[PDB]
């Protein structure tokens, strides 16, 4: 259903850019995806994995890894895992949760609110760092019960948003926003934070122009957000939302006015110049770096058939933009504002019409697209006589209908 | 010309083939009768659906 082969992808900064089980998730689907570079990428993955006393998913990277090794070992005619590191790493693990839950039961017995849910808190993260979900979630449930301020219920948050990022159940996440958005009356900058995580969450969810919304009042003071996600890869998400959903005038508003994707757009150069030929009608340029940013952002953990269609619908918008300033454009200077040729465009604009929103007819004769202008009263007046006869037709009916009521004519 | 029209600053259209700017003149000033045909197709569909719910 997935995995394309593409070069060029920079696994240490991808790879440093993100921290904790992000980047564990992060570079599993890079590994996953990307073949003839899966080999460094599950090295890496297994290297960092062995960090922080992971238990089943280290299992099942080391047994990926040895696949890997046992397939370069027959191409140019597997790494043991250390047994020791289970025994290690299960006792001192074992050893200090312990120790953990004896000290948070006993606080239990001393009927502490706030130092309950900081030990649950902390039972979460330990859980989250041995790699159970279920545990992590509980733990930071019974946190979330023992709440006493402000600035706990947004920790509380954060932490709920987090787990069901990795559990996938973005349904808590957007119900946390929503909670640590409205409650709070609506330098310390949580807000961007909450906004990061809603269109992150909103993106995987398939959703383009609020998540681009979302992203959108993100300011770039908060720099650091690698547990979920990068700012580069955020300034991509938000650029590709607004190019796919926003149009021009929109576009050119909510970029100029936020002034943090005007930072954003500084970090990935690439998006600001496609946007800038959007705007420019510059559609060729456009679309061939889009069709780059393709093949450099299809291995990405939340992008890949989200920004399939992103990018489909970038380019029907991108045709109705061009053709709009035009009641009559030759379709080979069309099919020249691009890499496509005449056949494809042809069909592609076909298709364009048949969905609609171009409004068009294309002159195959010499292969000119002359757009549609049609009187209003002419439309009107065939479409009234439509329904007058209609009209008729359904008075012809209920007038029927009489018949066989005032006669009483039935079925027996 | 291109980017005045994606303003919405000039009412009309380039024929590129001519070297050509053709602008809608726009002269009619109507628009009434596009009121008249959705006020007609939406009431007498709004009365063939209580006609037939009403029988």
Redesign the interface.
Known sequence: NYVVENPSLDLEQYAASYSGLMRIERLQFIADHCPTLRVEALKMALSFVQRTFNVDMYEEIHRKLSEATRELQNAPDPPALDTAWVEATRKKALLKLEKLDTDLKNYKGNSIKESIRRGHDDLGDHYLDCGDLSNALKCYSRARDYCTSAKHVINMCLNVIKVSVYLQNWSHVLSYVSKAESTPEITQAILTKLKCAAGLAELAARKYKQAAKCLLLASFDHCDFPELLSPSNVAIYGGLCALATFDRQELQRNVISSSSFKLFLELEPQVRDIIFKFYESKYASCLKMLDEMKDNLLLDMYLAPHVRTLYTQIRNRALIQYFSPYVSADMHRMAAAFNTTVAALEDELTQLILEGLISARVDSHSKILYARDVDQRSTTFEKSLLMGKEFQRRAKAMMLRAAVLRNQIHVK | ???C???NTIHG?????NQLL?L?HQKRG??R??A??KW??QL?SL??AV??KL?
């Open positions: 010309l291109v980017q029209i994606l303003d259209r380039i024929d590129q083939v053709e809608d109507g628009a009768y596009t008249l045909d007609t197709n007498n009365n063939q006609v037939s029988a």
